[PDB]
């Protein structure tokens, strides 16, 4: 009779959740690599090509006409 | 008025007000100032000497 006596639970009381950690790492990895591709192809790459093409005004060794 | 500090947390992120976190504590925790009313519980009692009286 009376309220239950307080007692700590014998642990460890955490663990067994590696599938959730896998999903975290897979999702972060995929989305981190999507950021690189989208940042490159949609912003960096275009601007880089323009610079190189305006760096061809120097035309010390611009690409040859034939060289097929 | 309410004793909470609205700006207790900073940085990018969604706004939250809470008192607690899950972060691990150091081997040698900062000695709490119990004389001024600071709390001493858990790691800052065991791994500190704030409890010793003369």
């Amino acid at each position: 009779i009376g309220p239950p006596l307080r007692t700590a639970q014998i642990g460890p009381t955490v663990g067994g959740n590696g599938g959730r950690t896998f999903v975290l790492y897979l999702t972060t990895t995929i989305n981190v690599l999507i950021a690189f591709q989208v940042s490159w192809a949609c912003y960096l790459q275009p601007r880089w090509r323009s610079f190189r093409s305006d760096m061809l005004e120097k035309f010390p060794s611009l690409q040859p006409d034939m060289d097929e | 008025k309410t004793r909470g500090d609205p700006h207790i947390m900073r940085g990018w992120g969604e706004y939250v007000y809470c008192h607690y976190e899950h972060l691990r504590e150091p081997v040698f925790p900062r000695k709490p100032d119990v004389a001024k009313g600071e709390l001493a519980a858990g790691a800052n009692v065991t791994r500190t000497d704030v409890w010793k009286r003369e």
């Binding site: 959730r20 995929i30 989305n31 192809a41 | 947390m9 940085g11 939250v16 809470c18 899950h22």
Partner: protein, 354 residues
Amino acid sequence: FILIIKDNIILYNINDSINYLWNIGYIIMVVMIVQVITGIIINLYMNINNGYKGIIYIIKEIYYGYILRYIHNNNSTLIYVVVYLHIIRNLYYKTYYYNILIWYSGMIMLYQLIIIGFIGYILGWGQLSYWGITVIINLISGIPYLILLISGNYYITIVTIKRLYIVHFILPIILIYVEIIHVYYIHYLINNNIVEYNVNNKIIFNNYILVKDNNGIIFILNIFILELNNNIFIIADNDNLIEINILVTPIHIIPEWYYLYWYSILKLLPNKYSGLYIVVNSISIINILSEYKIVISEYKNYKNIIWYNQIIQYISMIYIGIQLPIIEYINYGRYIIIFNILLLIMYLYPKKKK
């Protein structure tokens, strides 16, 4: 199984403080069963060799065939409405913070649904459907030779219809199995309440929650019956009733309304793969929105300002998708995508201490 049913329906305890937004899931399950049944029955009269002429023969010659045809099309719209609203709810109450397993099981069903709906559109064998698949299939045109293996020819033909039809017949039954895995986790991992904490206010399901859940489903039925018989809302594009002509391109190659968010993403980004990749991000990043947090809180029942701006981002992108590719809409839509990335970063980022 009777004891199982009694344990999961008759003696199942749920909090008495839940809203009608906790009835959306019941509706999905019921409307899903209706879509399978009507699909199987329609199959009794359909010839997938020409589904343009087959749909005509159902609506004109079969007795009450018009009911089957329009229910199967309109109940799809309904399925996606209820599902998308079920996600909006789960985001608002952040029901993924402690019940991630339930969230994962649901996302699997979302992926399956996205495939079922698209292929069902192509079974209609109309202009829009033909050209739409011809555009999507050409996104995996980089993977060498895979277009040919999926299509079965160098261009979409009945060969492609005969194989996608089997995926459309079978994949829904698997979805129903994942629904069991979903209801399994819900019953073990107790449902979330309108309040952030856990309270001893639970009541049995059959005597109370099912009566309320039926009031909800019957409310939706009244509205769905009006659409089913009078087309109060245009939920099906008219250009799917034009006979396929491979030589002429449709006025606008757009998907159904429930694929316009991802259609816009693909029409806004300047590189084809970047667009495909940003569609992956949309359906993958939302599965890790609580993983990096470190505070003992579920970020629940705040003003949810970030949530509101996300729900509007979805609606606004669907609008841009309807609109033709006017340059102005593309610039504005690219800003909406940048804003979505930022809102999603806000959810993900843990906070430092002052």
